[PDB]
Amino acid sequence: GTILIDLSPDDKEFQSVEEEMQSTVREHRDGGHAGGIFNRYNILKIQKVCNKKLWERYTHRRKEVSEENHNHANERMLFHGSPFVNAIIHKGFDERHAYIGGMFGAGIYFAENSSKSNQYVYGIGGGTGCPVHKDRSCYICHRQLLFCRVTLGKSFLQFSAMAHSPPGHHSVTGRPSVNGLALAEYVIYRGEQAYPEYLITYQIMRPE
Numbered sequence: 001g002t003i004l005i006d007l008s009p010d011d012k013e014f015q016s017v018e019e020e021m022q023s024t025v026r027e028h029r030d031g032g033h034a035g036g037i038f039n040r041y042n043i044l045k046i047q048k049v050c051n052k053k054l055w056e057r058y059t060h061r062r063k064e065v066s067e068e069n070h071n072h073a074n075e076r077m078l079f080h081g082s083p084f085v086n087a088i089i090h091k092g093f094d095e096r097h098a099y100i101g102g103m104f105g106a107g108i109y110f111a112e113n114s115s116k117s118n119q120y121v122y123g124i125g126g127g128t129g130c131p132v133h134k135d136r137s138c139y140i141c142h143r144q145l146l147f148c149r150v151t152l153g154k155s156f157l158q159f160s161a162m163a164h165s166p167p168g169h170h171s172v173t174g175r176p177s178v179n180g181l182a183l184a185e186y187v188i189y190r191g192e193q194a195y196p197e198y199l200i201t202y203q204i205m206r207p208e
């Protein structure tokens, strides 16, 4: 079902997506432990993920959410890192991708900071790092993230230092209160509320 289309780096669509990736890198409180030490990425490839059944699953669910929230899907584009991106792009999101120990419950987590999603590319807390070098800060191996269309609907606002949504909500917003430089994180509880739109292949870059 899924087919992947290479975007040219001269295409505006590519550039828009790259810019969203580069401009939402921040520093992490773990000093780079989970995700590596870097200020920027080497973007190697960006692919559009095209799957009819998964798209229609998304848009059908989105209409439902919209109708339950003053005609407002509250659709965002957000990052998702995972060692199972190959399974997500082919079969879509489901409970297997839920973060069971998540601070805002057992749901599927997304980030506004590309660097936050980068922390989960090799598993929770970076796992054991890249398969080839067992290095969480590997500058050599290729990483992949997803840049997804996520339907948030009415989103429970949780300030902060597969389950169900809170009643009358379609998602949760984890908004950092302490780190003012940290962007929001969002959780959904149905896989049908995200479409994995772009697969981004990259390396983290070692700082000068």
Ligand SMILES: O=c1[nH]c2ccccc2c2ccccc12
Binding pocket: 079, 080, 081, 082, 097, 098, 099, 109, 110, 111, 116, 117, 118, 120, 124, 185
């Ligand atoms: O991109 C993410 N991928 C994940 C994969 C598995 C578990 C948790 C997360 C997660 C948590 C917070 C923010 C972003 C992410």
Ligand SMILES: [Zn+2]
Binding pocket: 130, 131, 132, 133, 134, 135, 138, 139, 140, 141
């Ligand atoms: Zn490596």
